[PDB]
Amino acid sequence: RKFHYLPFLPSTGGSSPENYLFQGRQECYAFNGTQRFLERYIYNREEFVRFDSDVGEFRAVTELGRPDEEYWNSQKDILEEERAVPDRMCRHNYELGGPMTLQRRVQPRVNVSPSKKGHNLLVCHVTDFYPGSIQVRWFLNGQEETAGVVSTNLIRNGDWTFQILVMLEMTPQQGDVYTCQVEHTSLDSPVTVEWKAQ
Amino acid sequence: IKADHVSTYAAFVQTHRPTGEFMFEFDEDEMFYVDLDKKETVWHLEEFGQAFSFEAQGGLANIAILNNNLNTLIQRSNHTQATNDPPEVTVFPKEPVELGQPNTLICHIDKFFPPVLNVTWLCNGELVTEGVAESLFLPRTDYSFHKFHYLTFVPSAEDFYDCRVEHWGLDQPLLKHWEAQ
Numbered sequence: 243r244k245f246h247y248l249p250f251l252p253s254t255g256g257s258s259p260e261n262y263l264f265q266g267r268q269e270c271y272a273f274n275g276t277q278r279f280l281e282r283y284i285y286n287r288e289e290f291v292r293f294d295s296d297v298g299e300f301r302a303v304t305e306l307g308r309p310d311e312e313y314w315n316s317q318k319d320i321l322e323e324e325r326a327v328p329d330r331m332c333r334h335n336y337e338l339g340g341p342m343t344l345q346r347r348v349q350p351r352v353n354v355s356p357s358k359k360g361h362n363l364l365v366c367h368v369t370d371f372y373p374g375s376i377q378v379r380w381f382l383n384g385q386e387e388t389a390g391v392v393s394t395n396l397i398r399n400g401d402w403t404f405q406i407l408v409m410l411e412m413t414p415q416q417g418d419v420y421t422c423q424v425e426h427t428s429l430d431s432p433v434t435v436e437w438k439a440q
Numbered sequence: 441i442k443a444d445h446v447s448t449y450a451a452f453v454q455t456h457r458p459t460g461e462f463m464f465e466f467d468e469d470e471m472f473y474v475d476l477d478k479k480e481t482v483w484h485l486e487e488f489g490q491a492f493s494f495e496a497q498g499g500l501a502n503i504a505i506l507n508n509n510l511n512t513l514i515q516r517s518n519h520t521q522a523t524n525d526p527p528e529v530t531v532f533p534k535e536p537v538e539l540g541q542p543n544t545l546i547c548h549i550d551k552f553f554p555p556v557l558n559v560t561w562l563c564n565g566e567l568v569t570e571g572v573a574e575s576l577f578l579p580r581t582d583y584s585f586h587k588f589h590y591l592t593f594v595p596s597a598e599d600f601y602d603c604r605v606e607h608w609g610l611d612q613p614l615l616k617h618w619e620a621q
């Protein structure tokens with residue numbers, strides 16, 4: 243009912259002005275109900291040592307982390323507890339987090355605007371969605387539109403919402419119904435909105 | 441790395457400004473972190489915290505552990521320091537911009553190292569106080585960093601914004617400009 247964690251391991255040898263950083267990542271990777279664990283330690287951008295469940299032991303990514311590897315791998319209790327993580331910590335958090343994380347669904351808001359004179363464009367602005375997997379499609383009087391379209395890259399707002407812009411190439415006729423269409427794991431029926439010029 | 445989803449505790453410790461932080465990430469979005477002054481777990485989204493708790497001490501512990509480790513490696517490296525990688529900075533709205541209609545400006549700062557920053561907003565020259573919020577120094581795959589600075593505003597007709605940013609990888613404090621059409 244609470245997120246489990248993992249104490250980091252102590253390094254070996256414990257017994258603009260200056261700046262040093264030391265980072266540690268503990269990454270869980272989920273595939274088909276499978277779970278693979280990765281514990282890395284970075285000094286100042288340089289990842290020096292690392293544990294991969296799939297390897298079963300540590301590797302010295304740079305000579306800088308040689309002392310940790312030798313120590314840690316001749317330590318049976320350490321190893322046995324790393325190996326456990328895919329099932330202890332990873333499983334627990336993955337399963338615990340589910341509803342708010344894996345089952346997170348946010349309805350996108352859709353929006354269609356000109357932007358012309360002085361080329362000619364029509365932005366379909368799709369804001370506020372999670373997850374980031376989205377399809378966005380253009381229609382002129384019902385019929386699809388490949389040519390003249392530009393998708394921005396998927397842009398992470400970094401508040402657990404994504405944003406995206408898909409503009410179309412313009413040649414407004416007379417009775418033109420230009421429809422932007424979106425699809426997402428949240429809304430089952432594909433939301434659409436359109437535009438005319440009179 | 442052939443995965444469906446990624447959950448990682450990332451935490452760093454450094455000798456300058458941010459004495460170091462500890463957090464959790466789920467697919468590059470940050471879930472909860474531990475406020476080291478306040479000694480509490482802080483949940484990014486309100487509904488997260490109301491769903492499950494997390495032991496604030498555990499992060500505190502690891503932060504202490506990493507403080508330690510830092511010193512060890514300060515040794516076996518004759519105190520080596522990486523050089524400062526400048527930030528790539530963009531600014532864009534949260535919602536489609538429109539005539540006098542409540543919105544939020546986002547200042548995304550990318551690809552920088554180390555994570556020491558001064559970031560401020562300028563609205564027609566003026567430094568803004570109210571309306572400002574911000575993410576943690578987020579850790580990246582490539583051991584670089586990025587941050588988000590948030591400002592809430594109303595799209596005025598003639599009216600500009602610059603995102604003023606200081607970091608050692610620069611010397612020109614860089615500001616990206618921003619406005620409507």
Ligand SMILES: *[C@@H]1O[C@H](CO)[C@@H](O)[C@H](O)[C@H]1NC(C)=O
Pocket residue numbers: 518
């Ligand atoms: C690190 O220590 C060795 C001691 O043998 C020395 O040769 C070298 O000058 C030191 N490196 C730096 C960058 O000071």
Ligand SMILES: *[C@@H]1O[C@H](CO)[C@@H](O)[C@H](O)[C@H]1NC(C)=O
Pocket residue numbers: 556557558606607608
């Ligand atoms: C942040 O601001 C202070 C102002 O006194 C300055 O001394 C410091 O160098 C600044 N840091 C960066 C990284 O620009």
Ligand SMILES: *[C@H]1O[C@H](CO)[C@@H](O)[C@H](O)[C@H]1NC(C)=O
Pocket residue numbers: 274276
């Ligand atoms: C995961 O499902 C795949 C099909 O994509 C299959 O090969 C396998 O049975 C599953 N994985 C494992 C490790 O058993």
